[PDB]
Write a protein that binds this DNA or RNA. Structure first.
Lengths: 95, 79, 140, 248, 93
DNA sequence: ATCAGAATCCCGGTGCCGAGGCCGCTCAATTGGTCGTAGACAGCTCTAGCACCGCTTAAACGCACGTACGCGCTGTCCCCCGCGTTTTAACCGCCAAGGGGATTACTCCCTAGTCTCCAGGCACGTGTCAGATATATACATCGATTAACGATGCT
DNA sequence: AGCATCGTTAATCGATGTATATATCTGACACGTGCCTGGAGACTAGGGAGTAATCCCCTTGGCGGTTAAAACGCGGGGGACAGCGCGTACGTGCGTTTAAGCGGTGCTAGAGCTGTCTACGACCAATTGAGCGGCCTCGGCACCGGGATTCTGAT
């Protein structure tokens, strides 16, 4: 068995190495459709539009986890916590 | 439902890309909330541009103009 | 489709494919990936019934079935006008074009019945029925 | 409709398919003759399983997502003539090509052939070489609905290929006179359905389908002292509330 | 319908910088959206500079100042150098 | 749990410079007419979007288990706060020189506009190879246990 | 003083993932082609921008007197930081489901283009009243002086 934390680093290098999309298509598409139901009913989505929302969403969450990691490391902890997330979103001015 | 369709391994991978080493157990609900927020913010704009053109289809250009509308510019899908 | 990377390397001679209605379109991946299969001299297709009523894909069929028409793809779409003055239109369209189809297509398709081989088929064995609704459902 | 979603008496009282279904089942098991039925997928087959389990008439089940192990295993489970189960569920698309049976008899189709080649495809699974029984087919349709319009378009298509595949039936050895024979007689059939283009609740009418002889007409009178004699009716708040929740 | 793009031009410049290297279609789309982006930026800043100073004509001076505003540092210096050289050679010959 | 006491709120009084109303004096807002044209509306085509199922399999999920780390607690020490004293540079008030912003009058030449002509660039094909994938083989690295070397103790 | 034993850092070996070499196979990329619409050339009018000249007001500079504020120091108490220990929560691997991915069918709604045809906005002439710069009051608020009240800290 590997010492805890090695597999996590190997995954860091692996996913930071490639361009692969990290969220599965169909669940994200159903989520987009559900969220869009509350605005205007019976809407049509092009595939490139859903792909666009997936690109922007995944990139936004990656940056959010970068800044959250900066907060957790500033706290002298290697484990990110919700207060780190909402702290980053509080400093960015998003809330 | 749906927002739960975003999976613990998914968010886990998104954190692995961001450089996060170890993750607390409560990150997942907060990440789903933030994702729902951002998606509402972009989709309301995209649907606005869609309704203005009097079209029933939400295209890629509408999403690009919504992202550029909110300050995050996207390339490769047109603009 | 998954094992085309293996079973298509070896040479083949006589293939048997079943349910030509499953084959249907030539634009489907199955069709164009059967060309990735290299070659088998003899061929055949088994089916319980021909293609869809609209029949644009008579092309696709006789292309995968035969060397005949694969040269000109766009030809017969206007020659399909027989199906789509019932006496005169049935005459020109139906009688002309369909007499042509029979004239060309005789030595390919083969069809029989159960009464031909036996007559032990008990009846035409086909009926229908009707039903009603419920007001609580009918309001939907 | 109900919060408890337990097996209920009103599950089969909401529509007429289950009413006439509860009418035929005692005669189904009575006559000792089996039935094949075709369905749509997902919840339809589930609810039919819930009804056949409700009145407890045992059934096999088959569909697209099942494995090949119990596909062939279930196929073998049919082949035993001692079978105490009469009906069972089979998928039009998945299982329509899924079996070859000399021993079946009766067939029922709900979906009404989005393609006619599928209904005639899975339709012939009853009549087969060496059939010692007499086949009867039933299309269950409700009036004042889009589905009998789908049947309209269905035999409209049966005419469309009726100039193609029903033209292709006389071609085997390349005969001569039979083609115009099917043109005059068959043309009288398409003209007959040109007339067609533009109840059975009593026991006798339903008895007529599965009788096929007077012997069955006589033995089905034992089911007339309960279904008819019987020593509520079919049918608001669900209509207004249903209109509220369905208005999304 | 003919939808024009900058594709062939980015292709030519690519063959000037790296004659042996090709470009994928997606990267060409990214380059297209980049050129359109920067174009709209410089044109917008030129419109603002023309409006604040109360002039109805956009000349090379407003485009120059806009480039000096948008592009940080060496991009601005070398950009103004190349552009000034291009207008020079343009009006000279 | 409480008085001494330092900071703050509250109230009455006073002086002033900016808020608020008035009055000529425009010059841009309103009206009346034209004149060309952007888009409103109807019609036609046909593409991609919608639902659904069949079928396989990589991924998710549930669970058992270990140990890495978050967090609470304690001790230390150091460094930043609260206050006094001393110095200095901000501030305000006035005065003076002047040059750069602001305007107006005159002129010219750069660009909008239109007409004419043609080729630079574009959709549509054709061939064709860069690399993505698969198999085989070897290297980098983590995780484990060893097994050597040095130091200390005992004889 | 020498030898032996114990402690702990000094040592190698395996299994996993990762890199390299060859083969192969394809779908996206590079190039040629017919055509057509937008770019270049040529010509003309006119109005906006350049340019000279003048006016003035707001910037810069200086000087002197006041004084609030900043620098400098000096105790000391509380908080930053290191260490230590506990417990529990998350990584990690394995067996089991399960929907994702890919394909394939059937339908059709709305994207996309065109062709008229007309209400609607640009544009110019005529006219005038709403808003603005200059100019007057006068009072709400800054400032102050005194008293009552409240919140902090050592008994």
């Amino acid at each position: 068995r590997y010492r805890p934390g090695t597999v996590a680093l190997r995954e860091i290098r692996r996913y930071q190495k490639s361009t692969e999309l990290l969220i599965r298509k169909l669940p994200f598409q159903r989520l987009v459709r559900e969220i869009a139901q509350d605005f205007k009913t019976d809407l049509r989505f092009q595939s490139s539009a859903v792909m666009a929302l997936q690109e922007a969403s995944e990139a936004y969450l990656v940056a959010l986890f970068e800044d959250t990691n900066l907060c957790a490391i500033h706290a002298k902890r290697v484990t990110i916590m919700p207060k780190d997330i909402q702290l980053a979103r509080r400093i960015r001015g998003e809330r | 439902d749906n927002i739960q369709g975003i999976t613990k391994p998914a968010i886990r991978r998104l954190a692995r890309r961001g450089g996060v080493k170890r993750i607390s157990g409560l990150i997942y609900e907060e990440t789903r909330g933030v994702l729902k927020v951002f998606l509402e913010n972009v989709i309301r704009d995209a649907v606005t541009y869609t309704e203005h053109a009097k079209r029933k289809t939400v295209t890629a250009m509408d999403v690009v103009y919504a992202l550029k509308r909110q300050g995050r510019t996207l390339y490769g899908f047109g603009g | 489709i998954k094992e085309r990377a293996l079973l298509s390397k070896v040479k083949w001679v006589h293939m048997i494919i079943d349910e030509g209605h499953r084959m249907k379109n030539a634009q489907s991946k199955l069709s164009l990936t059967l060309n990735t299969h290299y070659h088998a001299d003899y061929r055949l297709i088994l089916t319980g019934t021909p293609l869809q009523n609209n029949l644009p894909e008579l092309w696709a069929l006789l292309n995968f079935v035969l060397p005949k028409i694969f040269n000109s793809v766009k030809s017969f779409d206007e020659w399909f006008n027989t199906p789509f003055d019932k006496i005169e239109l049935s005459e020109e369209e139906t009688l002309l074009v369909i007499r042509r189809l029979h004239k060309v297509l005789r030595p390919f398709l083969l069809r029989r019945l159960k009464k031909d081989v036996e007559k032990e088929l008990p009846d035409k064995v086909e009926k229908v029925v009707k039903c009603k609704m419920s007001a609580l459902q009918q309001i939907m | 409709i109900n919060p408890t979603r337990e097996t209920n008496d009103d599950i089969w009282r909401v529509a007429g398919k289950f009413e006439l279904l509860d009418r035929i089942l005692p005669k189904l098991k009575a006559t000792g003759h089996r039935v094949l039925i075709f369905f749509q997928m997902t919840q339809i087959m589930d609810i039919m399983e819930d009804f056949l389990r409700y009145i407890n008439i045992k059934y096999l089940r088959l569909d697209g997502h099942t494995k090949s192990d119990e596909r062939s295993e279930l196929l073998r489970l049919f082949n035993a003539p001692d079978s105490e189960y009469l009906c069972f569920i089979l998928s039009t698309r998945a299982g329509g090509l899924g079996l070859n049976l000399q021993t079946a008899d009766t067939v029922i189709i709900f979906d009404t052939d989005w393609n006619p080649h599928q209904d005639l495809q899975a339709q012939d699974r009853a009549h087969r070489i060496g059939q010692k029984n007499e086949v009867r087919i039933l299309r269950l349709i409700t009036t004042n609905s889009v589905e009998e319009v789908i049947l309209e378009r269905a035999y409209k298509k049966l005419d469309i290929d009726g100039k193609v595949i029903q033209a292709g039936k006389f071609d085997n050895k390349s005969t001569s006179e039979e083609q115009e024979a099917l043109l005059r007689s068959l043309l009288d059939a398409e003209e007959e359905r040109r007339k067609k283009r533009e109840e059975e609740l009593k026991d006798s009418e339903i008895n007529e389908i599965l009788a096929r002889n007077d012997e069955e007409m006589a033995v089905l009178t034992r089911m007339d002292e309960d279904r008819s004699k019987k020593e509520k009716s079919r049918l608001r708040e669900e209509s207004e509330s249903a209109a509220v929740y369905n208005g999304r | 319908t003919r939808k024009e793009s900058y594709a062939i031009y980015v292709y030519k410049v690519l063959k000037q910088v790296h004659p042996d290297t090709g470009i994928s279609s997606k990267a060409m789309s990214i380059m297209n959206s980049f050129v359109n982006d920067v174009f709209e930026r410089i044109a917008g800043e030129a419109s603002r500079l023309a409006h604040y100073n109360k002039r109805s004509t956009i000349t090379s001076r407003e485009i120059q100042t806009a480039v000096r505003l948008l592009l940080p540092g060496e991009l601005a210096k070398h950009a103004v150098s190349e552009g000034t050289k291009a207008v020079t050679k343009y009006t000279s010959a």
